[model samples]
Target: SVDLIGINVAGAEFTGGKLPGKHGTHYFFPPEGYFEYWSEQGIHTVRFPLKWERLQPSLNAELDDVYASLVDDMLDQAKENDIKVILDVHNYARYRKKVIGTEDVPVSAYQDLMERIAKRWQGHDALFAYDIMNEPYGSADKLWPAAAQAGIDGVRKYDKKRPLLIEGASWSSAARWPRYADELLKLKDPADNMVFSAHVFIDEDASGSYKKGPGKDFEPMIGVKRVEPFVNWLKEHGKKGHIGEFGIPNDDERWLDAMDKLLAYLNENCIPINYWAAGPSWGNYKLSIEPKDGEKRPQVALLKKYAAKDNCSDFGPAK
Candidate 1:
């Protein structure tokens, strides 16, 4: 059965330019009724995104208690809703433009953040996994592996049983995953638990933006083709994987067809997926599935057919 269908609750990661940003203005956690609504719909997992700077204003320093409590509040809702949460550090392996694993940032800083987060949240029933960083790129090609290993080691020190998510450099593009993440397999975890994450976007540039439209060459199979490298890598190497972000825009029957097929393909393979985004916010963003005017996004209708029936029992280690 298809398990772990989810949505990325996205408002928490917004306005990254603002340091220790004001909660309601610069960012906000999932709002009241967010979890309860989705829980009824059977989306049992949440890829909850957050900014690192807000959580830990100073590198290697204590996590801001106020910010940490906000996350705890979110976990409480997750527990109530019986929804598992993927704590996504959407910082892209950087803090204040300093690359992780660089002399200035140090891999240890990333480790400290992960360790503190794990220590604080490990016992929470709502916690499912930790995505250490989102979309690492550029210098991260050389720096991310070490940073990820450090994060894994640090978190294991506190919470040895939870899974750690490793994203490839170069934006974690599934099509390009083999090029960026082949070396990631060498990284070790004491718990022997880690999952590879890759994002898929079928736009012409393969960027999440669909502004150019699918181009004249679009085909429904493009979704399957774009994700094949990452999916196959998991099967061949016996590693588990998650498509951390993938979505369809509004009113597009063709895109819905592609998503339907993609969902089925992933379900058959037991690869859990979370839609690119949904939140109480995200007004008018074409890619967002956020409900508006009390109506669900058209995308959710198709997604429900594939994922809404599953329970939470199938969540497992990446292996």
Candidate 2:
């Protein structure tokens, strides 16, 4: 059975240019009713994305009270609705476009951010895990592992039991994980609660850009094949793997079949999945699983029909 199944609740990471973006115009958080809507639909877990800059505009500084309070409320609503949230730091190993582990954005600064986050909400009933960095990339000399460790250390400093998620470089692509991210095996955490993550987009480039679809050469198990390397990698190392993002274009029926087969394979291996995504501001995005007009998206229905064996939110106490 799949370990966990979920959707990514986005919006806080919407506009990149709008630094410390205004609440409504550039980004928005889901309201109280939003959690209830999904909870009723069998969604027990959600990946909550938030911009690093917006929360802590300057490195090693205090969190923005305005944005921080909003997040606090969202967490409260999630707990009330029985939805577990994966707090995703959606920055791609950068803060203000400055690469981490470099002098400009030292590893300690990243640690500080994680430490602060955990201090405030570590044992919060609504939080499921802490996703250190999303789709981190571009470290010619291999900086991701060490940097990831720092983030883990930060969270573990205050929050020991909560699971910590570490994503690989190169957009966290499943296909490239074995080759480009095997080094992650070396990352250390005293809690032993680390779970590796990778994103899979069966599009031609494995990029979520879905600019092209399956043609005459299309095969039903393509998605399964794409995730194989990551799955195999996890099994060999006695590690857990969580798919942080994966989705199909709504216009393609073939893509859905591919996803079906893929999910089945993941279930057989006990891998968790988070669809990419449902959010307050999707506004017609093709891969959105966000409900429309009070109706569920096709993807949402599909997930409900093939529920994972382990209720995503029922993993008793982080231990």
Candidate 3:
């Protein structure tokens, strides 16, 4: 069976105004019933995104107590609902407005940050994995593999059990996986626990940017083709992978059919996946799974169809 079927909870780490119904300058814990709602649908995981700056406003300093508490509360909620979590550092390879791997914020600081987080959540059953960073690009792209290796070393220093998820360059695009495959494969953890993460979308360009809507025609080639390189790489290396984010526009049967085919490929390969998001802070985003007028969105049916068979019980605890 697949490892996890999940949705992302965004906006908690955003640097904008107060998130929906929460109070905090740096974080917004998901409101009550958020986990329970998805847990009922057989969803087994939640990819929770957090900002690097919020977690540690000053480089190498102690993690903000308030922000840490909010994250702890979220983990508690996941445990109560019997769901796992992937703590995603939602920063795009930056810390305090400075890109990692640069002179101002070296990669060592990034590793230090990860070490603190890993030590804090070392034995929590709900802590499924650590998504080291999100959608790294530009100079961060060239530095991601090395920086990720540093992060892996840091986490292993304290918690040698939990799996780590490493994203590729160019926004973690499945198409770009091959460019970084060799370096990515070299990243090793003492526990041998890791999985490469990729993100894809059903855009004409398949960039996952949500910049364009579903075209008049739905072509699997446009979407699935972009991911073939990564999928093939995983097969070639006999490695596991996860699609941390993917989505299609709503109310479009053609696009839905394309999504169904794409998901089928992933399922056949035994790869797990999580939808783009299901949260209150998405506003009017086209791919949002949040219910409207108290009615479940159309994507819910598609998601439920391919949800994890065991709801994460089979995964057990980190060794």
Compare the candidates by lDDT and give the number of the best one.
2
The residue-by-residue lDDT of candidate 1 on 125-184, one tens digit each, is 899899889999887778888888988887898998888888888999899887777788
Model 3 lDDT per residue over 1-319, tens place: 3355678877677653332223443345678777898889878778888877777878889998877888888888889999889999988787765788889988889889999999899878889888888888887877788888888988889988777888888888888788876778778888987878889877767665557666665575665777788888887877778888888768567777777777777766666777887775676777788766655477778778877343443222212
- The residue pairs in collision within model 1 are none
Candidate 1 is scored at a TM of: 0.94
- For each candidate, give its TM-score against the true structure: 0.94, 0.94, 0.90
Cα lDDT, model 3, residue 204: 69
Error of 2 at 103 (Å): 1.3
lDDT (10s digit) by residue, model 2, range 1-319: 1236789999988899999889989999996598998889888889999999999988899999998888999999999998888999999999898888889999999999999999989868888899989988776227777889889989999999988888998888888788986688788989888888889988888788888878778989988898888888787777878899998887778988898898888776767889998888788787888867654467776788667355444221122
Q: Backbone clashes per model, in order? A: 0, 0, 0
How many clashing residue pairs, candidate 3?
0
TM-score, structure 2 vs. true? 0.94
After superposition of all CA atoms, the RMSD between model 2 and the true structure is: 2.9
